[PDB]
Design a protein around this ligand. Structure first.
Ligand SMILES: Nc1ncnc2c1ncn2[C@@H]1O[C@H](COP(=O)(O)OP(=O)(O)O)[C@@H](O)[C@H]1O
Ligand SMILES: Nc1ncnc2c1ncn2[C@@H]1O[C@H](COP(=O)(O)OP(=O)(O)O)[C@@H](O)[C@H]1O
Ligand SMILES: Nc1ncnc2c1ncn2[C@@H]1O[C@H](COP(=O)(O)OP(=O)(O)O)[C@@H](O)[C@H]1O
Ligand SMILES: Nc1ncnc2c1ncn2[C@@H]1O[C@H](COP(=O)(O)OP(=O)(O)O)[C@@H](O)[C@H]1O
Ligand SMILES: Nc1ncnc2c1ncn2[C@@H]1O[C@H](COP(=O)(O)OP(=O)(O)O)[C@@H](O)[C@H]1O
Ligand SMILES: [Zn+2]
Ligand SMILES: [Zn+2]
Ligand SMILES: [Zn+2]
Ligand SMILES: [Zn+2]
Lengths: 420, 151, 412, 425, 412
């Protein structure tokens, strides 16, 4: 049984990959290493052995891996995590040893393991054999292992330990620009009409993956072909689109944008908290003031939700922010003795209920204080925020600099806290 | 290894046992059964298969058992619960099967298991074999098993 | 996992005091029968605790290497009822490969239901082997505060070694070790790089030189220049404002120690993180010292400037105060009763918490008053600590001597 | 699993240095092992188990081997760690077999190193099997079991109750004389130079055990040999010294006052168990039901437990009370809690027994437990306050001798015109 | 344990209603493919519950025997992590010997940490096998009140059969069965012996005849006479005073049933021990019935005469009252909130307990008033129950008819 694929020098490059320029920039060292490993080796440089690619199904994880191999002009050895399901004895562990053997024979090359979660959740026999094979090869070999997963939460921590897949890259769902660029890439082979507006199609697809878009253009092409047309018109694209009715509602989008803008505004105003970055609708010693500020930022999303939508418009989205804010408040009071009422006593996590009451009271005091502060801030900058949300709704992703520029237009000078 | 003792008709009787007349009275049916099992069998009577004797060390548990056998003029087959500590494989379970085999050959007789707690606290392999051997023999055989324990 | 030496003390930079401690472990593993015929008994378990990347696994690997003895590695998370079997098997394997070393990383995962039964199996396996076997177990943890006290009891992991973050000297020595396999330029000043990396671990430094090497390679260079090292640096370092806070805290603890009525010798103040009987006064004093860091933080920065750095000292102080009240009957209100705790009335629990709060606040007010009194010579000590990163107890006393204040003779 | 049987000379009392008081204690064991019949005909009843406790390398196995040697009797050595398994009840079988072997080689000595490993579930079954094997053999057999531990604090109390290891001897770390006497013993087989001063070496090795000193002279001999010398000079001894903790005098005074405190309670008790050898053993070393106890007996047991702390407060004040009373306080409270919640010995609580209980009853129980302990603590304190002057005398003797007999305590009190209760041994 | 038939319904005396229920299990085990091609699904698990010695293992053995199918026996106490493995193995063995029967005695030991993990493994093994396998699991328990509700959920032991203690008729039939292998005299009246043994189980009767046989043998007799049987009897039987208490209690329940506003048919009163929606009134009425027995005990004997017999009816009544309040929001004070319970404030717990006490006391006072009202015709019913041991619902109604009281038509 089993099956390992070898594409000695692929034809997919970065021109076939759209809208993940930040990711493209990260992996550029992997390309440069695969091109010439001895340039690296002759300096003492040790690139990653394993690189984990995680994201939703169809965001382009296998595509990015194939493009890395293609850009470097290096063989791409593909294999699936499910293909290490032993048929009697420990044949699963043997396949792992053989894959790396094959790879070393084709060096400089790339190993690609799709569904690494299937082999890394007898189970620990193949898993351990992978772990030892990862520790077995060196930078001298000139090989790199890229694994992909949709479920990184169920991955064995051992796999992500140093020397193994200690580098992890999250590949996100495309924003408006992302979507348009993907559509352009997949429209290249297709005979599209002049009337087709891919810019509209991108705006009309919030929440779709690169795969969904590739399928949308493929479906529109099949519709135009069956209809007996040489070109693909907006008619076929709209028809192909309708097979989407688990998307982002425009009302839902507005709620996300207000919440996200809420956090950013807190960050760009917080007294000494640190570094704000890319606002998107798409998924050490600290002093008492620093932590009050961190709480302030965490409550920002919800504070914006209430200021903009009322007490009936506050949403389930603030769930983790609220948890995190309260956890932090509880640590300030019961662990770091940052409460005058409780004093410098520490209860690490036996207690009288009176102390527990006193602790809960103080935690409630801190959170409400900060929630009132956050709300007042949103209320103050409601007009330039409305402007940011409007930009964030049409672009889906805005830079911190873009946010600060919008505020600059409303004559408000924010803190220089954008990530550089 | 192992060692099973057989005293075909003992010399200890109730005259060698003192001050447990209530106990002596209880066990009198066991004596009467061992003397003539078919008298019991020809009526539909089913005496106990196993009798547990428990008390402090030295109160006369082996003595009472030996006196029961002696009063009935029936062989006394002695064995210790610690002698069912297997030396490789499940040789412990085989010894149990063999003890009851020996007993059935010497019927009407008495099996005596000192320190039953050692075999009845692979552990459940010998224990279960004892349990099945207990369920294996009937009143027709004319045999009784008396076990003694301090714990 | 079963490995062989190939790593020694030459790959371990600094921690010479730690290196000296473990030297008996290396001498025992070399020939256990010398130690066996001797009559002496080495430790069964040795706990290595510190921040991630400080070189706990490295030290353990170096111990095995220096002794030329097999190194059997395992992690705490690798341990439903099959957890207890794995422990039994690990020690079985070890005894077969004797003289050798067992290494348990993340001992906190197994030593904090299946989570509490494997723990006992480890405890019994620890009590199962003797000095005759010629084997030693070294455990490593990043969270020793969450460790089960049973693990540290006599016979099992009763030896504990704290591996600290490297000081400027320590950082330079590590950089030298990790620069050996790198093609560095003449212009690179590793002494500067050490000065520029306060707060980094040996691992961070190893990665910093590795990253600089990869940059120089990417750039198309035959050597690594300061440019690359600065670039790799930018890609975890203690801020000067953060440094000031640490220095004030550290000075706070030392001042309490050099003023506290009885015992415990004070030592080396740095901007880097029982067989004995103690009386009530000794423990009040130990609390006083523990609160010193925070007391200094408040006196110098205010209630809004108090920091997260006091976390362990506050825990320790409170843990000590609860023991005084509920275990050693050192409270008049509670009396000489000892509660070891789900059979105790809430009224007694309240009375205990009240007394613990009384002790801590009493001492916190005392500590604060002391910092307030010696604020000017303390400012002087902090200025020296900021400049030098590390100062001797003697240096501290001499700075106070300049301000006409004679402190207690409690150094080394 | 194995067991090692030693045949008799080689190790006698001449190889044991500086524990003459201990040597004197064990002399009855050596006499009994020589002819078990002659000593029971005389009237002397020997111990079944003798516990030797101290730091590692302090000569516990050596003393045991010397006892067997002096008596010309087999020495059957075994370790506690050899009786552990989890898988199968083979641990309990090994214990039965060890005693079987011993009875076959009588008169002989059983030696159990690391008794703490078997004395702390398959390990429990083995512990009980040891306890029953201890109760199984008699003086008629001609066997004595000597157990050694480095951790006596973690030992199961069941092991030390009467009939078992009810005799305990603490072997201490050698002082300067002790160290010197050991050095002399281990220097006999060594070619030492004229310039070597063993008196200096003794002062230069504070904290070392007899084992460490034996190794120090062995290492110095190997260094002189590898240097190409026929004699061992101070040079090699200093070099051997380098190749490789303490108890405070103020701390010692606190221990002595605490220990004296317990003994005074015991010798005044009104009704208690026997009191013996008062000693200054460090925190690390040093160490019921089955029968019927009345309310007065238990009040008295609490009184004795609080004695150590009561002395600490009377002598040093509320700021001088120490962490040493930790187990005394725990035990006293546990006993008070049993009196109230289990044996209905409280009028307020009544004859109710709590094995799911209202906090009001829990409060009422805690109150009564606090009442009992404080009552007894005030009693103990009053007793120490009353006999403060003869106690000061006892502590002064205890500090200079480090160990005083129960008889010595009573005769110190006799000097102050105070007749104590006849307890001791 | 693995046995073969050799025991049928001829060895089981009485329980004809139970025998009728289990007849589908015997028809399914005979040829499961007839039931499989049918489309119907027999039970996976069948729970047999009753007092010790009533013949639960006997009935199970008879089911296997009548079907000519292997009987695989095991007990609940025979089940650290190795407990879950044994369960998996038992079902493995069963599937290999199909069509056959699994028998689990003392299911309460495994179905009430290792005690809670083997339980789940049993639950998953129950959900693991299908009707295609042609196997059935029969469990037996003496304490079904302490059984985990998860065990009785659909797919697993969702069928429960209560095996009762034998009535006078039942006792005689058992005696006949166990007298077959005994040499009894002509003078022995087994009808009398049945009358003389109220309260005994089938096992007690089997032992009574066995003991009589051993006595007759000891005495040196070729037959067993009434002398021996009376002697064996003296060597567990319900006192006439005890009988009166049971009869008053049983009459109490029946009277409540024949007076309760809505539904539930009343049946056979004896001195021997969901797919439906219910409204608030129906449940108040069910509580009323459950308290009836005790209400009669107090009305007739006083507060000092109330007995231990009301134990289950009181439990059931309270369990029903708590469900009304905390699950079905049938309390105005508590409201339509449902609490399923370590996140709930003590104030709500108090409010719940108060309401539960309110409901029970309300109904207890009601029940007592009803018994007080019909005390004279009840005395008459108790006299009949004492004489006959068992009376029909119709008989009860006819006794009340004599006292000019027309009851509700709720019999059969
Ligand atoms: N960012 C993207 N740019 C261009 N095409 C994309 C992108 N993401 C996905 N696609 C297309 O979607 C398809 C599925 O990509 P794939 O890598 O297999 O998904 P996954 O992340 O599950 O591995 C491919 O044909 C690929 O060209
Ligand atoms: N009741 C008794 N009457 C007479 N001798 C007794 C009695 N109990 C014990 N003995 C004597 O004590 C000895 C030990 O008896 P034994 O049966 O072996 O004790 P155990 O109860 O432990 O089995 C025997 O020699 C026996 O004669
Ligand atoms: N003191 C040190 N000297 C030299 N290298 C060090 C030092 N501390 C850490 N390192 C390096 O950093 C890396 C991580 O160390 P490691 O022992 O695995 O971490 P941890 O302390 O979490 O167990 C190793 O590759 C080691 O070479
Ligand atoms: N009191 C002593 N007199 C002479 N030699 C001693 C003394 N104490 C220790 N030694 C020597 O040290 C070595 C270790 O002693 P040992 O009996 O194993 O100690 P322990 O049983 O306490 O661990 C032995 O060779 C012994 O002769
Ligand atoms: N209804 C009955 N008819 C005949 N014999 C019975 C009856 N009930 C019990 N017995 C006898 O009593 C004994 C005990 O019955 P058993 O089924 O083992 O008990 P349990 O109900 O506790 O499982 C058996 O030997 C059986 O023959
Ligand atoms: Zn948020
Ligand atoms: Zn601190
Ligand atoms: Zn004490
Ligand atoms: Zn009832």
């Amino acid at each position: 049984m089993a099956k390992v694929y070898i594409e000695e020098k692929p034809k997919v490059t970065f021109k076939d990959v759209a809208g993940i320029e930040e990711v493209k920039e990260e992996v550029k060292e992997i390309i440069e290493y695969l091109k010439d490993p001895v340039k690296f080796q002759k300096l003492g440089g040790r690139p990653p052995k394993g690189v984990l690619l995680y994201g939703e199904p169809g965001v382009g994880k296998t595509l990015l891996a194939k493009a890395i191999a293609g850009e470097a002009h290096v063989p791409f050895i593909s294999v699936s995590g499910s293909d290490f399901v032993e048929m009697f004895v420990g044949v699963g562990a043997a396949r792992v040893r053989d894959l790396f053997e094959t790879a070393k024979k084709h060096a400089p090359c790339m190993i690609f393991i799709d569904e690494i979660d299937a082999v890394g959740r007898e189970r620990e026999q193949t898993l351990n054999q992978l772990l030892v094979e990862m520790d077995g090869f060196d930078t001298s070999d000139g090989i790199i292992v890229i694994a992909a997963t949709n479920r990184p939460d169920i991955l064995d921590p051992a796999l992500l330990r140093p020397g193994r897949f200690d580098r992890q890259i999250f590949i996100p769902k495309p924003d408006v620009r992302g979507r348009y660029e993907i559509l352009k890439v997949h429209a290249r082979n297709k005979k599209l009409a002049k009337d087709v507006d891919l810019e509209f199609v991108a705006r009309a697809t919030p929440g779709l993956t690169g795969a969904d878009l590739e399928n949308l253009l493929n479906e529109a092409a099949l519709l135009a072909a069956r209809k007996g047309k040489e070109e693909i018109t907006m008619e076929e694209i709209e028809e192909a689109l309708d097979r989407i009715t688990m998307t982002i509602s425009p009302k839902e989008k507005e709620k996300i944008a207000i919440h996200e803008a809420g956090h950013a505004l807190m960050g760009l105003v917080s007294d000494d908290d640190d570094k704000v970055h890319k606002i998107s609708i798409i998924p050490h010693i600290y002093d008492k003031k620093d932590l009050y500020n961190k709480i302030l930022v965490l409550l920002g999303g919800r504070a914006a939700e209430e200021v903009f939508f009322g007490k009936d418009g506050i949403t389930t989205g603030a769930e983790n922010d609220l948890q995190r804010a309260t956890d932090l408040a509880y640590r300030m009071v019961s662990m770091w003795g940052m409460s005058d009422k409780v004093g410098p006593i520490a209860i690490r996590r036996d207690t009288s209920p009176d102390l527990l009451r006193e602790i809960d009271e103080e935690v409630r005091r801190i959170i409400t204080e900060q929630y009132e502060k956050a709300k007042a801030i949103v209320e103050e900058y409601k007009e330039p925020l409305k402007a940011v949300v409007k930009k964030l709704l049409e672009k889906e992703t805005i830079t911190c600099e873009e946010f600060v520029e919008v505020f600059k237009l409303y004559g408000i000078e924010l803190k220089d806290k954008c990530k550089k | 290894m192992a060692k099973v003792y057989i005293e075909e008709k003992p010399k200890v009787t109730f005259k060698d046992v003192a001050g447990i007349e209530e106990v002596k009275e209880e066990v009198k049916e066991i004596i009467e059964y061992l003397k003539d099992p078919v008298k019991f069998q020809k009526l539909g009577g089913r005496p106990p298969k196993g009798v547990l004797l428990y008390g402090e060390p030295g109160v006369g548990k082996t003595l009472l058992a030996k006196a029961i056998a002696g009063e009935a003029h029936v062989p006394f087959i002695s064995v210790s619960g610690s002698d069912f500590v297997e030396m490789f494989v499940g040789v412990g379970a085989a010894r149990v099967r063999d003890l009851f085999e020996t007993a059935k050959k010497h019927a009407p007789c008495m099996i005596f298991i000192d320190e039953i707690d050692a075999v009845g606290r692979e552990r459940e392999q010998t224990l279960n074999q004892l349990l099945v051997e207990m369920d294996g023999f009937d009143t027709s055989d004319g045999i009784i098993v008396i076990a003694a324990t301090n714990r």
